[PDB]
Each structure stands twice: as C-alpha cells, then as structure tokens.
C-alpha cells in the first residue's frame, strides 16, 4: 500500500505475513483455527510449476500477530490453481486466540454486488516501493465487473480478447472473480498485498466476512481496478479439504 491509514489498533487479527525463501513478503489470511487461505500464485514464488507441495512447504516462513512465528505442516493447492488462484496452509499447532490473533469466518451470503465497500489489509510495498515496515490497510469500493473486464482486456466476447493490460502481465478474469474499484483518494494495493482478504463488515449482524482474496496485486498506481477471487465460490471446496 502506497498511501495511508496506518494500522493503529490491530483491527485485522486474521492477517498473516508469510515471507518466501528470497525475502519476498506476502499476505495470507487465517481462515480458521488450524488453517489459513492464500493464493496459488503466492505459494509458487521462487518455485517451478513442477514443484509439488512437499517441496514448497519447508521453504516458506510465516508470521502472525506481531512477530509471532507459527509453524506449518502441509500445503494444499487448488485443483484449478492456474485458474482459481488459491492455496491452503495448515499450521502445525493451534494459535492462541486473543485480541490481536484470531481467524476470520467464511461467508454464507454472497456480497459481490456493486455499491458495497470492503476493507483490504496489507503488508505490501508503498510509494517508495519499499516493503512496508508496519502493516497497513485501506478501504475500497466494489467495481462494475464489465467495466473491469473491458478495462484489463478488450473484449467481452472471447475472440476479441487482446492484452490491453497497463502492466506487462495479464490478470485472471473469469466467473469466479470480482473487481474492486479504485479508492476515493486513488489509493491502491501493490506488491506483497496478494493473499490478503477483502473483508466486508456487515453492520446489521456486525460481522466481518472475507468475500474475496486479492489475486492481482500488480495494479498499484497504474491500473484502475484491483481484482479478487470470490471466496464463496471455493466455499464447497475448502470444506471438503478441511476434513483432511
């Protein structure tokens, strides 16, 4: 995150900062007492597509709360990893729940419609492109899915698709994703902010749901809409996995 909103209280206790083998800081969120979601992409840094879970699991270092080091047993990848970009990390033991450390609930309802607003935390880079010394966070509205599609590629209809992406690489855009708009003050989310959850606070029933996880963290200044993979669409998949 390049802009502001310093995280004073620790209002986002489910945010974990995992650093890959070559000192690259990346986001992951604690989805229940034994497990945390992340992205397949985040998992695959500094590793070949050949690499399997047994290879990847010992490489990572993970941090919860302030410095708190929780160990990590196995790793599991979404079967559609190249399309649905999601990993799961299982922690070697339980984490003590308290005011600063505690998992987030997976949503039953689907808040993907435009007009809602959400809160994305992050450990990513800032406007000096330095990895941030302290976790920060930002509020973002959700954006019209068609405006976002026409934005990143050219098409709608798949034969007119061309790489219109302001950055070098093309994001994954399908029916399992949704796009969040730009900030009010044009703030956005950059390198390191993948794997952090797009968390919408429901005021009537007062609960914070993770509707999506941030996939494309490249947009930063230059690209008007960040894009998340809805967690609700992997709902029935994550439950199946938790049983093992």
């Amino acid at each position: 995150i390049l802009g502001g909103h310093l995280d004073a209280k620790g209002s986002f206790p489910w945010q974990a900062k995992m650093v890959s083998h070559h000192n690259l800081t990346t986001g992951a969120t604690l989805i229940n007492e034994q497990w945390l979601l992340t992205t397949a992409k985040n998992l695959f840094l500094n590793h070949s597509e050949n690499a399997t879970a047994k290879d990847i699991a010992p490489t990572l270092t993970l941090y919860v709360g302030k410095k708190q080091l929780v160990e990590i047993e196995k790793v599991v990848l979404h079967p559609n990893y190249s399309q649905v970009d999601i990993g799961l990390i299982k922690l070697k033991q339980k984490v003590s729940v308290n005011e600063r450390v505690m998992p987030i609930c997976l949503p039953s309802k689907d808040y993907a419609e435009v007009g809602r607003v959400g809160y994305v935390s992050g450990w990513g880079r800032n406007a000096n492109f330095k990895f941030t010394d302290h976790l920060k966070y930002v509020m973002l509205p959700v954006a019209d899915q068609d405006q976002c599609i026409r934005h990143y590629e050219g098409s709608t209809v798949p034969e007119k698709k061309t790489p219109k992406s302001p950055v070098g690489v093309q994001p994954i855009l399908n029916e399992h994703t949704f796009c969040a708009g730009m900030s009010k003050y044009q703030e956005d989310t950059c390198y390191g902010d993948a794997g952090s959850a797009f968390a919408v606070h429901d005021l009537e029933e007062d609960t914070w749901y993770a509707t999506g996880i941030l996939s494309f963290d490249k947009s930063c200044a230059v690209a008007e809409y960040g894009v998340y993979v809805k967690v609700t669409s992997i709902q029935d998949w994550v439950q199946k996995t938790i049983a093992e």
Binding site: K9, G10, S11, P13, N98, E99, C105, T207
Partner: peptide, 10 residues
C-alpha cells in the same frame, strides 16, 4: 465466532 475484534476499525 464472527464479528468481534477487541478493538475494531471505527
């Protein structure tokens, strides 16, 4: 549980 941070953002 859902919805109870000791100190929320607000």
């Amino acid at each position: 549980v859902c919805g109870k941070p000791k100190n929320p953002a607000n």
